[PDB]
Amino acid sequence: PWKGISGSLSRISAGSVTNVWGVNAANNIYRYTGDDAKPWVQIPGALTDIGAAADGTVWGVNAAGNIYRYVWDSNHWTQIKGALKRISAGSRTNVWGVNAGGAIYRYTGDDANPWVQIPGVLSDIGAGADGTVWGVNAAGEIYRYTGDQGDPNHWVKIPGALSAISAGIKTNVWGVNSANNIYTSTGDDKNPWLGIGGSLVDIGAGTDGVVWGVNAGGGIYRWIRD
Amino acid sequence: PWKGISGSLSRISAGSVTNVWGVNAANNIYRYTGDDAKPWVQIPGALTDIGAAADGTVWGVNAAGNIYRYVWDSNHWTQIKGALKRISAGSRTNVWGVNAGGAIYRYTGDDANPWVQIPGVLSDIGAGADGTVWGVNAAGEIYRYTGDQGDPNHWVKIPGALSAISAGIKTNVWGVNSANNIYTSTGDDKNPWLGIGGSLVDIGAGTDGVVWGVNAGGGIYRWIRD
Amino acid sequence: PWKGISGSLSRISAGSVTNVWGVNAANNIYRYTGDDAKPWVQIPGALTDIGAAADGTVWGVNAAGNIYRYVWDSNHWTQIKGALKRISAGSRTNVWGVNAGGAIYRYTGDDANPWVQIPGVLSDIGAGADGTVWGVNAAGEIYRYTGDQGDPNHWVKIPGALSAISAGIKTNVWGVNSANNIYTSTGDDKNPWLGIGGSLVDIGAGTDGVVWGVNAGGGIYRWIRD
Amino acid sequence: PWKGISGSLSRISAGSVTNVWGVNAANNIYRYTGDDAKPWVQIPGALTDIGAAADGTVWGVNAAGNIYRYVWDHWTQIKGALKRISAGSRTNVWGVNAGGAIYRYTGDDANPWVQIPGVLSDIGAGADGTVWGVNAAGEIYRYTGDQGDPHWVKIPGALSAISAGIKTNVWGVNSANNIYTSTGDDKNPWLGIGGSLVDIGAGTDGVVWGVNAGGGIYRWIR
Ligand SMILES: C=CCO[C@H]1O[C@H](CO)[C@@H](OC)[C@H](O)[C@@H]1O
Ligand SMILES: C=CCO[C@H]1O[C@H](CO)[C@@H](OC)[C@H](O)[C@@H]1O
Ligand SMILES: C=CCO[C@H]1O[C@H](CO)[C@@H](OC)[C@H](O)[C@@H]1O
Ligand SMILES: C=CCO[C@H]1O[C@H](CO)[C@@H](OC)[C@H](O)[C@@H]1O
Ligand SMILES: C=CCO[C@H]1O[C@H](CO)[C@@H](OC)[C@H](O)[C@@H]1O
Ligand SMILES: C=CCO[C@H]1O[C@H](CO)[C@@H](OC)[C@H](O)[C@@H]1O
Ligand SMILES: C=CCO[C@H]1O[C@H](CO)[C@@H](OC)[C@H](O)[C@@H]1O
Ligand SMILES: C=CCO[C@H]1O[C@H](CO)[C@@H](OC)[C@H](O)[C@@H]1O
Ligand SMILES: C=CCO[C@H]1O[C@H](CO)[C@@H](OC)[C@H](O)[C@@H]1O
Ligand SMILES: C=CCO[C@H]1O[C@H](CO)[C@@H](OC)[C@H](O)[C@@H]1O
Ligand SMILES: C=CCO[C@H]1O[C@H](CO)[C@@H](OC)[C@H](O)[C@@H]1O
Ligand SMILES: C=CCO[C@H]1O[C@H](CO)[C@@H](OC)[C@H](O)[C@@H]1O
Ligand SMILES: C=CCO[C@H]1O[C@H](CO)[C@@H](OC)[C@H](O)[C@@H]1O
Ligand SMILES: C=CCO[C@H]1O[C@H](CO)[C@@H](OC)[C@H](O)[C@@H]1O
Ligand SMILES: C=CCO[C@H]1O[C@H](CO)[C@@H](OC)[C@H](O)[C@@H]1O
Ligand SMILES: [Mg+2]
Ligand SMILES: [Mg+2]
Ligand SMILES: [Mg+2]
Ligand SMILES: [Mg+2]
């Protein structure tokens, strides 16, 4: 079930139990501390979406579409040229975004030439440490990336409808639909989703299995198995 | 202690908290969902043993000795030539089996030429993500693989008796004996086993520390530390 | 909060949930079993500090300054030439120590020529699986290693005062001050520490998020998030 | 077998599915985009060998022997001279120089290399600490200098290029261009894999990429 955690957030991303970040409605940025008694520390800056990876990589975008990577020093963030609306970092080497037109981009590893457009149209995306990438489009159709596995069409459609998706590793894929219903991937593409009790508007599914979410009213939860 | 989980299984393998599979007595295949309220989803096919790795690799064998690897798409399984009785996958690159004659094989990474025989005789085997491999023979003697570390005899005998063994990583080795008594490796080859309260016929020890087991009556348990 | 664990230890190191070692005041060596009902097994030998990594690497030093690496066989330990007072192993490839004069050394991977001196003076050090290295000096000043990232001064000073530090991965850094007060890194170098309720003299912060500590009276604790 | 990926390269390294780099004959540097349809982006600079790690680490050497580490913001020169280089991770970086002496990165940019006893012409360094090498003559060695062997153990066979992503993912080519992968059995160490290649890069996650004499690029399809 979900454990309620104090605080208020609008979006959230979890790469591992030790690297969990979110933004609130005012665009303040927070990082989870590891202590549920005082779970959040505000990190300076302003973001509207964030992607945090198991390896410590953190990327964000702001209201204007400006893109940032955390540099783990007193400068805090560095702006990376281009414009994005949503972003997910599975690792240093697997960072993806969606711009305001729905175009899909992948970080090239070159800050001087940082993005290559990957064919397709999405509204949210979730990238993993192992190369896993899932997305959803504005109508809720769900896709898994195949463009690095020889598929000239780049994406395979997986049945169902979701509005937010996260995939920190191949085996930890979660999403929510437009009515806030929570789902997790079964690993069977022909019976792909299990409904999970609860209600969320965004979700972050980590490489080590950690799952965090936020609901419509800004309430924050972590998934508890044991 | 052990947390009882609903369902009924005959064998089980855990590569990580997010990749846990089992088979029941009817040879139905199940994958753990991450929700203990509804812990299992049946995956189509029929298997008598399964090996699931932290990296998502899943291998199985059926009653006839047919060998399969999960392809994480709508085809579900692909049959790999050869015949095995027991199988363990520590990773994509560390997959081992034992055939009905007790001969030991290692997956070569070439589906057209998939197995090389490794000297020795075993009845169960457990392979890890870091290359770790342990086995037991029909009389219960316990061995750890040394054939990739210069040892011309391939295996070092470790004192004790076990009938099932699992080793998802060097530091997470568990087994059961023929009387269903549970043991975990101490890491001291001269005092190698600690008895653990409980009773199990098969056990799966994951790379991230997760431990699952099944008992003689098909009852399922996950190890809880906290 | 902290879960009390039975036993008595003077120092402790945790690389992952499955690789946690400590030494007691008599210099006996123990490894955590994974069962809190019987949490420790004594490993033969005598050490005054130990460093245990996620990948299974374990290094120690004894009262005389002798340095040892665990060989995961019936020989138990191998002595490595040189003299150290404190040691930390983040991985097989990231092992650091501090000698009795405060000089800082890094394991070269060559047992015949095992140490290179890294400029600076420390009293405790903590190394990670991802290359992360933090240290503190005798006055409590805190430093993070930058000498493999182009910095000719080798260390960046981070505000605060600590007497023991551990850093199993970039995102899991913990320390204690000389008054036994516990702190964890926020990831903001300008607001770097969060106070954690409790009292400890040594702490081990694992690559997978596990955190163990020992207090002044030898009492042992594991950090619990859920 | 192998899937042909468009382009042409002379040397290649894969640390993981998502970190694959190569250089072409002209010494132009390329990184795999993750899009098989538009598979390469050129990275500024000139190199003759490159090593890419699972954690994103990238090191290279130029024709002259200058050594560079990629900075992910393009290249910083690190003091010394090397002819080949491999990086399994930030903390496991090895190379050989033109005369065949073997070096490992110290983790100290101001004092960056320590020489390791022996003679090699290619080397593969893994994320888990695994190091394999081949000598001019084609003899194959695995490193044991960090586990009590006063350094290298010879494994039978002959190879001209070698790559190790992990203890369990080791590949090489012989001078005839035959491809081999390590079996995990020192007494029967090699399995021949169908095809012909001149360089190969093997990742920790099982990823394997290669280039043939003519510059054709291939990814192994398990
Ligand atoms: C702002 C610079 C150019 O913009 C276009 O190309 C860039 C990529 O070069 C996009 O940024 C990711 C942006 O969203 C848009 O599609
Ligand atoms: C008609 C096909 C092209 O676009 C469609 O398919 C592509 C994928 O092929 C989607 O991009 C992810 C897009 O959202 C849409 O559903
Ligand atoms: C029309 C059938 C599917 O709709 C429902 O069930 C499916 C799951 O089977 C959801 O897809 C993820 C969808 O969002 C919705 O809740
Ligand atoms: C079924 C094909 C040939 O069988 C023999 O060799 C193969 C290996 O080539 C074995 O399969 C693993 C099988 O068990 C047996 O020993
Ligand atoms: C007499 C030695 C050969 O076989 C024995 O030793 C080998 C190992 O050397 C065992 O194989 C794992 C086998 O089960 C048996 O115990
Ligand atoms: C005869 C002494 C050993 O037997 C018992 O204890 C040992 C453990 O010390 C078990 O070995 C794993 C064995 O299965 C049995 O339960
Ligand atoms: C004991 C051998 C030589 O000692 C000196 O150099 C060695 C390093 O070569 C140090 O051991 C780490 C020791 O502490 C001292 O500084
Ligand atoms: C005056 C500077 C040299 O030493 C100081 O700085 C160095 C770091 O530059 C410290 O070493 C870690 C040392 O402890 C001390 O604080
Ligand atoms: C003088 C101000 C700082 O001192 C206190 O707070 C700081 C934390 O802000 C501690 O630094 C880690 C220090 O040890 C002490 O407890
Ligand atoms: C057909 C295009 C010419 O190939 C050029 O660009 C390609 C990349 O588009 C290079 O392949 C890696 C090739 O080496 C050369 O520089
Ligand atoms: C001086 C700039 C152009 O090339 C030089 O520097 C670049 C790096 O800036 C090297 O490429 C990696 C190249 O080999 C050469 O040494
Ligand atoms: C200037 C020093 C001479 O360089 C020697 O040692 C250096 C390292 O100190 C080597 O670079 C790796 C170089 O190849 C050569 O053997
Ligand atoms: C005493 C032997 C010196 O060199 C031989 O053995 C060494 C290894 O001991 C090789 O270096 C890796 C070298 O290439 C050669 O085969
Ligand atoms: C003695 C056998 C001849 O060696 C052949 O096969 C071996 C492997 O058995 C190759 O070594 C990797 C070698 O290059 C050659 O092709
Ligand atoms: C056409 C089959 C034989 O070789 C061709 O294709 C193979 C791959 O199918 C290449 O080996 C990797 C080889 O270099 C060549 O390009
Ligand atoms: Mg997101
Ligand atoms: Mg099994
Ligand atoms: Mg310590
Ligand atoms: Mg190479």
Automatic annotation (TrEMBL), chains A, B, C:
Pfam families: Tectonin (PF19193). Belongs to the tectonin family. The keyword Iron-sulfur does not apply. The lineage of its organism: Eukaryota, Fungi, Dikarya, Basidiomycota, Agaricomycotina. PANTHER family: DYSFERLIN-RELATED, FISH-EGG LECTIN-LIKE ISOFORM X1-RELATED. It comes from the Eukaryota. InterPro entries: Beta-propeller_rpt_TECPR, Tectonin_beta-prop. Keywords: Lectin. This is Tectonin 2. One of its GO terms (molecular function) is carbohydrate binding. SUPFAM superfamilies: Fucose-specific lectin.
